Amino acid sequence: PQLHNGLDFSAKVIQGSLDSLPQEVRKFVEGNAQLCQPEYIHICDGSEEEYGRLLAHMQEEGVIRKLKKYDNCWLALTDPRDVARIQSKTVIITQEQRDTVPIPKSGQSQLGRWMSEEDFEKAFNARFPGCMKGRTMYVIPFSMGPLGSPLAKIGIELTDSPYVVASMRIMTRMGTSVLEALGDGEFIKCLHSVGCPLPLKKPLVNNWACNPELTLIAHLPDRREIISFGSGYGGNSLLGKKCFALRIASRLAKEEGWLAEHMLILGITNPEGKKKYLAAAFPSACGKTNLAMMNPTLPGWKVECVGDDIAWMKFDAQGNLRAINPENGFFGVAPGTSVKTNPNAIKTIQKNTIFTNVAETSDGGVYWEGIDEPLAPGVTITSWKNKEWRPQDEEPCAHPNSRFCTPASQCPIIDPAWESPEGVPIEGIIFGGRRPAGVPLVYEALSWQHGVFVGAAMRSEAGKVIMHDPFAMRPFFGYNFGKYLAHWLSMAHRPAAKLPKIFHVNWFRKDKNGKFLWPGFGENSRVLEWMFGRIEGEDSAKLTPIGYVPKEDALNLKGLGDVNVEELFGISKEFWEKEVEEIDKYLEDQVNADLPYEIERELRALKQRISQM
Numbered sequence: 001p002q003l004h005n006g007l008d009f010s011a012k013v014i015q016g017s018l019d020s021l022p023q024e025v026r027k028f029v030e031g032n033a034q035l036c037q038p039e040y041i042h043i044c045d046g047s048e049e050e051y052g053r054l055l056a057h058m059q060e061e062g063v064i065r066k067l068k069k070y071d072n073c074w075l076a077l078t079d080p081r082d083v084a085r086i087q088s089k090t091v092i093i094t095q096e097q098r099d100t101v102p103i104p105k106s107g108q109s110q111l112g113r114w115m116s117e118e119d120f121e122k123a124f125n126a127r128f129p130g131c132m133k134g135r136t137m138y139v140i141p142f143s144m145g146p147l148g149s150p151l152a153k154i155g156i157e158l159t160d161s162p163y164v165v166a167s168m169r170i171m172t173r174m175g176t177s178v179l180e181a182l183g184d185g186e187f188i189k190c191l192h193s194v195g196c197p198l199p200l201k202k203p204l205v206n207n208w209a210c211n212p213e214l215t216l217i218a219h220l221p222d223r224r225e226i227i228s229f230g231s232g233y234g235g236n237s238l239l240g241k242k243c244f245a246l247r248i249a250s251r252l253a254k255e256e257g258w259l260a261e262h263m264l265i266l267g268i269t270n271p272e273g274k275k276k277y278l279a280a281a282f283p284s285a286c287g288k289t290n291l292a293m294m295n296p297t298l299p300g301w302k303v304e305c306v307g308d309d310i311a312w313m314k315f316d317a318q319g320n321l322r323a324i325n326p327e328n329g330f331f332g333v334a335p336g337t338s339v340k341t342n343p344n345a346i347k348t349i350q351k352n353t354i355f356t357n358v359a360e361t362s363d364g365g366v367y368w369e370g371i372d373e374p375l376a377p378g379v380t381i382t383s384w385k386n387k388e389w390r391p392q393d394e395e396p397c398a399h400p401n402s403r404f405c406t407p408a409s410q411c412p413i414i415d416p417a418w419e420s421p422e423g424v425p426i427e428g429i430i431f432g433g434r435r436p437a438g439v440p441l442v443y444e445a446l447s448w449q450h451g452v453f454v455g456a457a458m459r460s461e462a463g464k465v466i467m468h469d470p471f472a473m474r475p476f477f478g479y480n481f482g483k484y485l486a487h488w489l490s491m492a493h494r495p496a497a498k499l500p501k502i503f504h505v506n507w508f509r510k511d512k513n514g515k516f517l518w519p520g521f522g523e524n525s526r527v528l529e530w531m532f533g534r535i536e537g538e539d540s541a542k543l544t545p546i547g548y549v550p551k552e553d554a555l556n557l558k559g560l561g562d563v564n565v566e567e568l569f570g571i572s573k574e575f576w577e578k579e580v581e582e583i584d585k586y587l588e589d590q591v592n593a594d595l596p597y598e599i600e601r602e603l604r605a606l607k608q609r610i611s612q613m
């Protein structure tokens with residue numbers, strides 16, 4: 001067992017028992033306790049008592065504040081250094097770089113960031129030894145997906161952050177039921193530290209532990225490990241959220257024949273009581289959570305939310321593409337959320353919700369840019385930097401990507417099948433981003449192969465810059481993007497597969513004065529209606545060089561007589577000639593030797609159709 005007394009950590013367990021853990025879970029826990037040297041080990045049970053007590057503890061320490069206007073809601077303000085851009089510090093380790101990213105023809109890859117095993121071991125050894133001294137190591141057993149779903153996967157996160165424990169309780173299914181379900185099965189090992197052992201070597205800013213200089217978020221898919229150091233925030237610390245959900249899961253999906261994607265899942269029911277599930281991939285700032293929670297303007301239509309951010313999808317034996325939301329909550333952007341843009345989110349977030357980096361009103365409510373509602377005379381605002389703040393100051397009151405973290409079970413339009421273990425059958429997949437010019441409101445891909453190309457060719461506005469963001473997965477590919485494209489294409493050769501219809505949307509086209517041509521939000525229900533009929537086989541499309549678009553009079557524009565359908569659906573030869581050239585250069589450089597034949601063929605075909613305009 002040991003010749004001395006430093007290997008068995010049983011004496012330091014303050015909740016639970018090392019003896020009751022599955023064998024490999026114990027090894028993971030105790031091995032990392034030996035390395036990181038926590039004071040205590042707390043095996044989380046996921047109970048309400050655990051949660052409430054931990055929140056009250058963070059409140060007493062000043063790590064969070066209670067938002068007294070609402071029911072059991074809380075506010076955390078971070079060190080502003082811990083929400084800087086850290087993609088340069090997000091890496092995947094594999095034996096061969098080409099398995100992680102394609103080797104580009106001319107430039108640096110924008111499709112991921114590889115780190116060698118050797119460089120990672122050095123980075124690891126310079127960070128983790130002793131990193132939890134004086135702190136509790138929490139052990140978070142969690143399921144990504146409904147417990148017992150054939151599509152669910154289990155993780156164990158070790159963390160020294162109570163904020164992570166509380167947020168993981170919301171965003172995943174956490175606690176004793178998961179350990180019991182796991183037994184001696186496989187799981188993803190998730191190791192997290194804020195990187196600030198006690199006694200603190202550097203000043204603590206805003207009661208928010210982090211280590212920006214050593215921040216590193218690493219994924220080791222061939223070891224089934226996620227190892228994250230130095231950040232307490234978001235996808236860097238809630239290791240289910242992106243690390244597991246997309247980066248590790250996309251690699252597992254490649255190995256196992258399924259898909260892990262940055263997609264909402266919604267259910268839409270028409271006035272004839274027919275319901276279809278749709279998935280949609282848009283980048284950050286492009287409105288997945290607005291769509292997923294849409295309040296439709298068209299009478300007799302209903303939208304319900306399965307998930308707002310991650311989809312895990314697998315063709316079943318019957319050929320249906322079955323999707324689950326592997327999350328348990330919504331980790332939504334707060335700024336821009338209003339009664340106009342997302343009324344269902346406004347309803348959801350007034351109880352049991354943790355907010356990070358938003359402003360606080362003097363009566364204990366929340367505030368942010370784009371909230372689009374006034375404060376009673378008297379009510380004052382504290383910014384996310386803990387300073388008094390007034391409407392006409394230059395600095396925003398909330399961080400621009402500040403977040404709410406809310407239980408999915410509270411959404412008033414949560415779908416009745418949102419945690420069905422079998423998943424929901426996807427009939428359409430939608431791509432899109434911000435395109436101020438050139439790209440119509442909606443078009444439909446001509447085939448599966450064309451649809452994969454449409455995903456691959458996605459671009460979005462960041463002077464303005466238009467960047468590529470294929471499949472809305474640019475930050476998140478777990479492996480070589482060319483091999484991901486081949487994996488998508490391979491779905492067409494699968495037995496019985498019912499390949500969903502693929503569409504591309506653009507909510508963001510602008511006129512010459514910079515005004516949005518389309519009102520969007522709940523009005524996007526009109527576009528969903530057209531997609532719905534297309535899936536049913538309706539003769540509602542006209543062929544163009546980029547795909548099918550709605551026929552004249554096919555789109556329901558009742559209540560929107562002022563919309564300029566001609567500018568909104570216009571397709572210019574000049575624009576599209578440039579577009580195809582841009583996509584060609586991008587795919588050649590960035591995908592290079594790993595570009596599938598079928599994607600190059602779709603590029604050639606689009607070029608040719610544009611040439612005949």
Ligand SMILES: Nc1nc2c(ncn2[C@@H]2O[C@H](COP(=O)(O)OP(=O)(O)OP(=O)(O)O)[C@@H](O)[C@H]2O)c(=O)[nH]1
Nearest residue numbers: 282283284285286287288289290333336507520521
């Ligand atoms: N004009 C217009 N803007 C929209 C529409 N839907 C959403 N937005 C804008 O999209 C932004 C919100 O998108 P985010 O919450 O960042 O997008 P997301 O896809 O949920 O992002 P993540 O949560 O980071 O994955 C705000 O600027 C909204 O005003 C629309 O239909 N029209």
Ligand SMILES: [Mn+2]
Nearest residue numbers: 288289332333
């Ligand atoms: Mn979102």
Ligand SMILES: [Mn+2]
Nearest residue numbers: 262283284309
């Ligand atoms: Mn996201």
Ligand code: NA
Nearest residue numbers: 077206207208
């Ligand atoms: Na703080």
